[PDB]
């Protein structure tokens, strides 16, 4: 089962850099 | 002959702007195409771990 766990991690940890990009761009959009 | 004679005796013009409000713009655009993939990725990860219940219950 460990190998399907690393596969679930390959999806679920590719969310973190996504949420970071989103939480970055969502702070560009507050000022002009 | 006299008395009053001392003085003298369309289709479509197609406007467009009418009675609406003013308009404005800005250039900080378009993260949004990423979430359409976030959403459909994480949706798969749900089903993937429903399977990980079943594939451990079947043991």
Q: How far apart are CA B9 and CA A11, in angstroms?
A: 87
Which resolution, in Å, applies to this structure? 3.3
Is the CB of residue B38 less than 8 Å away from at least one CB of chain A?
A: yes
Q: Which runs of consecutive H residues, i.e. helices, occur in chain A?
A: 2-12, 16-28
- Cα→Cα distances A13→A17, A24, B23, B38, B40, Å: 8, 17, 42, 12, 15
Q: How far apart are CA B32 and CA A21, in angstroms?
A: 11
Contacts 24+ apart (CB under 8 A), B27-31: B28/A28, B28/A29, B28/A32, B31/A21, B31/A22, B31/A25, B31/A26
Verify whether the Cβ–Cβ distance A11 to B44 is below 8 Å: yes
Closest approach of B22 to chain A, Cα-based (Å):
20
Beta carbons of B52 and A7 less than 8 angstroms apart: no
């Amino acid at each position: 089962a460990l190998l399907a766990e690393l596969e679930a991690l390959s999806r679920q940890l590719a969310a973190l850099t996504q949420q970071v990009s989103e939480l970055r761009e969502q702070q560009q959009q507050q000022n002009k | 002959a006299a008395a009053a004679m001392t003085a003298t005796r369309m289709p479509s013009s197609g406007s467009s702007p009418s009675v609406p409000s003013s308009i404005i713009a800005e250039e900080k655009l378009l993260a949004l195409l990423a979430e359409l993939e976030a959403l459909s990725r994480q949706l798969a990860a749900l089903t993937q771990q429903v399977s990980e219940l079943r594939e451990q219950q079947q043991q």
